[PDB]
Amino acid sequence: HWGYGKHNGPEHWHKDFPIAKGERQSPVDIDTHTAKYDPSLKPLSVSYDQATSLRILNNGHSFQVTFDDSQDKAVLKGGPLDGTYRLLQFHFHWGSLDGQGSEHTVDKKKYAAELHLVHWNTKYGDVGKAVQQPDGLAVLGIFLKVGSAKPGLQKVVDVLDSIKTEGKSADFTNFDPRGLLPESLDYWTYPGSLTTPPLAECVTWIVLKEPISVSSEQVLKFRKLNFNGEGEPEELMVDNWRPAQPLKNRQIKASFK
Numbered sequence: 646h647w648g649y650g651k652h653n654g655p656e657h658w659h660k661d662f663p664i665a666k667g668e669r670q671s672p673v674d675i676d677t678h679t680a681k682y683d684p685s686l687k688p689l690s691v692s693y694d695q696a697t698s699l700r701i702l703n704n705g706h707s708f709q710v711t712f713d714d715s716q717d718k719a720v721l722k723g724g725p726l727d728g729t730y731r732l733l734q735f736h737f738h739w740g741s742l743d744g745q746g747s748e749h750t751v752d753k754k755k756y757a758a759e760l761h762l763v764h765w766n767t768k769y770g771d772v773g774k775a776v777q778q779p780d781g782l783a784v785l786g787i788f789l790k791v792g793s794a795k796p797g798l799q800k801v802v803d804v805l806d807s808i809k810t811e812g813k814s815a816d817f818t819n820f821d822p823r824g825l826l827p828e829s830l831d832y833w834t835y836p837g838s839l840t841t842p843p844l845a846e847c848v849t850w851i852v853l854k855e856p857i858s859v860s861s862e863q864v865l866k867f868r869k870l871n872f873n874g875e876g877e878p879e880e881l882m883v884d885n886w887r888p889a890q891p892l893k894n895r896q897i898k899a900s901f902k
């Protein structure tokens with residue numbers, strides 16, 4: 646199946662998922678001088694006070710923290726969105742070195758990593774239905790740069806040796822995703838897609854302008870994870886990012902002047 650190496654990486658994905666060459670693929674480069682300020686954009690509403698985390702999982706392409714989405718516990722609203730979207734999971738994309746790893750770029754600048762908080766539109770009832778709709782998901786993207794440690798990330802870092810290889814999972818209850826957010830919720834937004842297969846064109850992307858800082862020790866622990874399952878030749882889970890895709894007939898809008 647698909648992955649991030651020479652022979653199964655993003656250049657190959659269109660063969661099994663031909664929407665890879667579609668009209669609203671993600672990620673994209675955010676040209677900040679071309680993105681237009683929209684004064685009609687509302688502030689984001691991030692309501693995570695009741696978030697209920699469940700598990701942390703190595704899925705062979707990232708690690709994921711999954712939440713209870715059977716109720717409106719942790720929801721994203723406002724911004725460019727109409728309706729309520731429930732937080733299902735978050736995961737990251739990162740590099741083998743600090744100068745690459747993010748999926749979106751800002752004036753061609755690459756961050757060391759990128760956090761994706763994945764939400765689905767409750768009017769579609771479940772995420773499987775939502776992925777089939779052009780407004781089915783909203784992914785909140787947050788850049789990571791290397792500098793000071795992010796204290797709200799360390800509980801995640803602490804447990805990664807227990808899910809080194811594909812298929813391993815662990816209890817990861819009582820995690821507060823509010824500890825991963827930057828101060829500002831100013832954002833860019835465009836219509837796009839999932840950045841891994843099935844690459845469905847179902848995502849309103851909301852990318853925050855302010856990155857969070859993480860320490861070199863924290864990102865080091867990401868780079869120690871493995872794509873392989875246990876017992877297979879060890880291939881470090883690094884550079885699990887899709888490069889920027891053609892913007893085509895899309896405009897990126899900014900919530901801030």
Ligand SMILES: NS(=O)(=O)c1ccc(-c2ccccc2)cc1
Nearest residue numbers: 761763784838839840841842843
């Ligand atoms: N990297 S991402 O754009 O935030 C992403 C989120 C969810 C999914 C996904 C995969 C399978 C079923 C539902 C959602 C894929 C990519």
Ligand SMILES: [Zn+2]
Nearest residue numbers: 736738761840
């Ligand atoms: Zn992602």
